[PDB]
Amino acid sequence: VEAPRIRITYEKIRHTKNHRIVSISGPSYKRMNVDLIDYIIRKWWFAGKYIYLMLISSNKPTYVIRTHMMMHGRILVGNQDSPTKRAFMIIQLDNDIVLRWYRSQITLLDPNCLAEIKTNYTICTTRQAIMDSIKLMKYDLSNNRFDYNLFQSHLKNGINIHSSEIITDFLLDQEYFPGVGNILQQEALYDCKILPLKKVQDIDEPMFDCLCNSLKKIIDLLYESYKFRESGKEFGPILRIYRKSLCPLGHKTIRKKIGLRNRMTTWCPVCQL
Ligand SMILES: [Zn+2]
């Protein structure tokens, strides 16, 4: 799951805000080892591949639930009737709405906790992880809080730091491209005719700008495709290189795992040089 699916999920569930938890269950809930009955949903937000849920209750500690949706991971809105099978967590609210988590990493974050944890971009305290999420929203290409100028400045630092690694590895760095996943990175690389094996240091100013524009364009297209489906329409195909045997020009493609991340990338050796 990658952008803009995280935003889409957020937009679908955020109107559960201000409602009370009547019942809650599932293995992922038990694992957190905290009673959340009668807590109130204060706020939802998202940053990259993380969706955050703030829960409050009078005279009780505030908690944040962090969700990382894995492959075929979803948070679904339903009711008591809906099937619960295979769901990691079930939350029923006071208005009979039921939220169901599937195939997701679910973590309790205590904002007052100073224990060190590993996130998808660093190692930091639990408290710092929550604070960082607020800052990382500005770097999320699909987020409404995206800040172009701050993103560009931030990106320039990362280009200097990760100069030695291949471009695919850098495009998947969740500190600099939060929300970007395997499909986006290779679609963008083909769109800009850049070889995935090319090092970051060997990419010039206009082409990094080119990559960022391509990434945001494809995210826009994916989001627009969702908007079409919602109204009962079909937007049409938009993928050009993902799992394709032939590039749209007709060249034979190469498909293998690359980089330290070892993610499977399809590229055209002719078009992308
Ligand atoms: Zn080609």
Swiss-Prot record:
- Which Pfam families does this entry report, sorted A to Z? H2TH
From the UniProt annotation, give the residues forming the signal peptide: none
Keywords annotated in UniProt:
Metal-binding, Zinc, Zinc-finger
Q: Which terms in the Gene Ontology molecular function aspect does this entry carry?
A: damaged DNA binding; DNA N-glycosylase activity; DNA-(apurinic or apyrimidinic site) endonuclease activity; zinc ion binding
Domain of life (superkingdom):
Viruses
Q: Where are the zinc fingers (FPG-type)?
A: 240-273
Q: Which InterPro entries match?
A: DNA_glyclase/AP_lyase_DNA-bd, MutM-like_N-ter, Ribosomal_uS13-like_H2TH
User: What's a single GO BP term from this record?
Assistant: base-excision repair
PANTHER family, A to Z: FORMAMIDOPYRIMIDINE-DNA GLYCOSYLASE (PTHR22993:SF9)
Q: Which family does it belong to?
A: Belongs to the FPG family.
Q: What is this protein called?
A: Endonuclease 8-like L720
